[PDB]
């Protein structure tokens, strides 16, 4: 429809105001002494939470320009969350600082593109410096330490994470469900995991987790696109009679089929969840055959000849449980016979032996690795259901943090890592004065998280920041105890991956922002 | 949609205004001389009541921020009422005092987190001091005394409560009903009680009680989640033909099933109430088997093999009466044969004998206790139905107060308990000046209930407060007679549990309130 | 009345708006292709002028803050004009450029004091570089050249300035006069020249010149302050009877005496104008004695004993003509006998011989220099009275420019001198980033005059500026002919003194304004 365009520095200040609103809302909760923030609920009592993610997701502004600023900063922060598992608040704070300083500079007659280039140079130098300061977390002891730290200083969950870590190797799959007994139970069952996200958010049966947990679902294997729901009618009737959930893995799903399945989930006569086919091409077909072996199902392909209409319940695979992460899937305890899986593993091993291409060999090796390693299962054990839920959440976030730490490393948390790299990079110079100003903007903006944490603690931000910059190594300021020392010794730790991703995404969105003039919006009605 | 965000001290004063409105509305009715408050009725004459709970539930403001403050304070006060059985007004008054003083302090550049920590330390000290000041109420004479006091000084109801307490022991179940004759009737019939709340408030057939009373309902036992209503169709047809109510206990009930059953209750062709399955895992299954033994029903589980479609009226259990409390459920006079129940008791006793884990042993012991103790039955006795209703309500509240007193104890009521604790804790000091100020704020806020009671009585609040603080022990101010003396002597008593819970929840909501900066709401339209 | 105070960047932008208005108003006329600007007149037609000074003096704004900004910039520009004789427009343009860039940088969150220090360093380097680039104008040929150039390319006036310059030496005194005949005349008559300004602007009998020309005025010499007008009554009566203008040279004049003299001048009975006594102490008294020697007057001092009441017309001195400029005075052809003046010269020469102090020797030497050198008179010669006036104005401005050039030197005019200095100082660095930014601000602001001249010519400013910066030496852009070359060869020349003073005063006012935060004014009524 009709749109109104505002461009120039007026658009910039509008977007800055939107980002300021969102950044204040999020940064209030930063740090161990983070102040609570109350969220509206359409009905009943409002919630109260220190979680930055929820408050961030709840922010929408009235006037459109501020809304776009907040929405796009929020989207980049959510991308950072999905990348690692935390650091939305840090990313938003960094974005706010960089935006404020860079837009001030641009309003000061600064070349925005050179500012972007300088910020990019500064952030890549900071990233490599941070990698230099990373501490390995390969040993099981540090793994238990970080697991304990992430879950509010609980050693049992750290021990469980370390045990499962040992069970399923370095790059194993970890899943957690609610254990019946008071004792924690760890077991290894043959499972699956591939990086594919759900078709629509509406399949999420548990919105507070953002996943689709199904019990004993009948999986359907298809190498074809779901053009028409007529093909889905017989299997839909069969599963409706079976009265059990189901999974759909297919080459593609058309939009109308998606609307039909959304309707069939709102009705929920059938618990249907679909997801893109993993792999690609011949690799996709081979791994779909592997899934068929795991779940005892059968692949339905147009090229081979069989059609989805001629699909029985026996043709479908099955598994004890599946979970559809926002960008990943998990299969647990496939019904398929283990001997068949072992034979498939041997076949793919022979394919590896005869493999000559390097990347094809890598694909085959990771295929057999994820085929044979399986999925670990962690069962929470305590007395009361309330503690089932809270300890399950703690185990989930601790697992995310621990795997992030294992992937890259662990650096002194509390925001002091950014301060350390900033002090290390005090003499970084660009190609000219413009990029130099951009570099300085980035360097002084990387101090925002620690300053905000200290301000939330009620102490003086600048004094603490200067004292930390004076020190070297990992010597930072404990927010909780208000005592200086070494973060590694006192356990305040953050994964290298989360800090790196948050910093990079904040820099990316900030640089993208600094170089925008035109805005288009619908008329305010 | 678009959301208005207000953060800083303006959000604080908005929430303070909302809390002030709600607190005035509730505190007006506090005390024996509490002034009446008139409420709105969409049709007919307005209702006039001194009950703080109703007026509290009917308060919610126009502008959103004050509404949030009122709603969160109301929710916490209602949580206190559910936990104990009274003290909604006391909790609201304490919350108002603490919020006013704490926000007044925060406006002076005071560290909110230290204020919260000081308040928490002060309330913990107050709780332990109150426990020290508690008077045991284990003897039957004090039980009768508190029963008489709670029910507007009626000795007959106190005697009945004492008799039932003797019948079903210290932690027995007690239920109230309507007796045909003028004489009061007492009897013990095997029954159930477990802490589970209703799925939906819409199941409440008697909103003024907040419960679901059913006469001769057909109970259905399920260990599975109610995914589809097709499974519920045959049993629903059977019970529609039977023309009797029913109970539903299941592992879970999905939202679509909840909507379907809400529709089936609005039609009310079938009188249906659903509730979560108590226990957990194997313990859950074992107690579901116990329920089947009590009610003569049968557990329908996927794992065993049978399905809910093959549900006959014989398969369902039955009982003479059930009541679905907000967070509890009660079964009365299960049809099942007593010999089978005794055999199950013996089996669980053998399980206790062979039990090794202390927790499993405790679960088995409480299982046999709840299986064998049964449920007490108290039938109100008088002539007119008006007195049936009022005496039933009196028995209900007296039973609540008496069980609360038995659980923890009884302290001098009328608000002097908090005054005594405050006088005892006059020298409590925090880690610094900030926590000390928070401690003083809490201490002077604990005097609010007595001051409000005296103000309602029309006398000078501060004079009476000082006179009470001068005394020691339980000496206080009888508001009703306007005379001083030991409150225990003249029987102005409150349970220790209700005062402790009210104070603790007021402190918790105050700590949440003070540390709030950002508010997000929907735009006023 | 009350006063409105505005501080912060809002006052800065108010001043910026005022400076912008005044600056573009003045700069429209800059350059040989300067565009006309109309002015005000309460009666009759408005006046159209290309003179920056006339338009500048007329500008004042309606709102007080930007009015203060314009007023102070105008005052500093007028100071620049008085210092040398031109460069008001250049000073205003430089001030505008520096103010815009510096206030932009200050809005960029940059330390204003460091900006001021960097600008001061840059302008000092620019001044010394300009002195290095100066071309001497000692020889009579260059004197004639600059005289011709200043007076719109008229060789006769430059020639006349050359002969007068030779007559009265390098530091001589030149006065312009109206000549009866068409031939130009030159004569040397003993006269004074001391740097004192009029007591009041109201003495100005010819406002378009800003001077006080008196014909055959009597002179009253006094070493005392004029406390009371009673002392002035007898001499006032004597000069009123004489019907001739009066000149008052005295130690000081009190404010009420000034009001009395203003009233008398407005009455027109006496054409009196007063001036401060030059010198200091004994030196002042000695030069007053010298003035008495010239004019045949007598010094009336309290210490000697005589009083101003006992003053006859004989006691007063006399001269053929006097002119009182803004801060300058001229006495022409004192009546007193030349032999007495020569005797006084011999006395002061003996004092020089016996002088031991260096500065006293300098004072005596300059005193004999002004006593013996006298004053040259250049009588303009043409036919019509209109050309009398225009050629007299041309002679005035050419004399000012020529003496300015003789004092310091002559650098390539047309604004390219600043461009050359800026190109020479491209690598000047400050102590830190802020001073460096200020240096760059000044360096890029020195290009404003040439850019504005080119823009007034209608050509492309930046292209011409780049082309000039590419060249070295005095190579620049002729605005009139739109041809490049050497400014010296084509005669486009400006004195070193005027450019230096304009740049220095623009830098001074810019430094003062950049470091301004608060402003206090009267309420707008």
Residue numbers in the entry:
A (entry chain C), B (entry chain B), C (entry chain L): 2 to 526
What does the literature reporting this entry say, word for word?
Gro-EL is a ring-shaped E. coli chaperonin protein complex that helps mediate ATP-dependent polypeptide folding. It is an abundant, ubiquitous, and stress-induced protein that assists in folding proteins by interacting with incompletely folded polypeptides. Gro-EL forms a stacked heptamer formed by 14 subunits, with a molecular weight of ~812 kDa. Expression and purification of the AAA+ ATPase ATAD2B complex in E. coli resulted in GroEL contamination that co-purified with our target protein.
The NCCAT collected three Krios datasets: ATAD2B-apo (9,541 micrographs), ATAD2B-ADP (12,945 micrographs), and ATAD2B-γATP (10,880 micrographs)(step 3). The GroEL-apo dataset comprising 9,541 micrographs was also processed using CryoSPARC v.4.5.31. The processing scheme was similar to the GroEL-γATP dataset. However, in this dataset we first performed manual picking from selected micrographs to create a high-quality training set. This manually curated set of particles was then used to train a Topaz model, enabling more accurate automated particle picking for the entire dataset. A total of 513,428 particles were extracted from the micrographs with a box size of 256 pixels. From the 2D classification, a total of 148,146 particles were used to generate one ab-initio class. This class was used to generate a homogeneous map with D7 symmetry and was further classified into 5 classes. The final map generated from non-uniform refinement had a resolution of 3.7 Å according to the 0.143 FSC cutoff criteria.
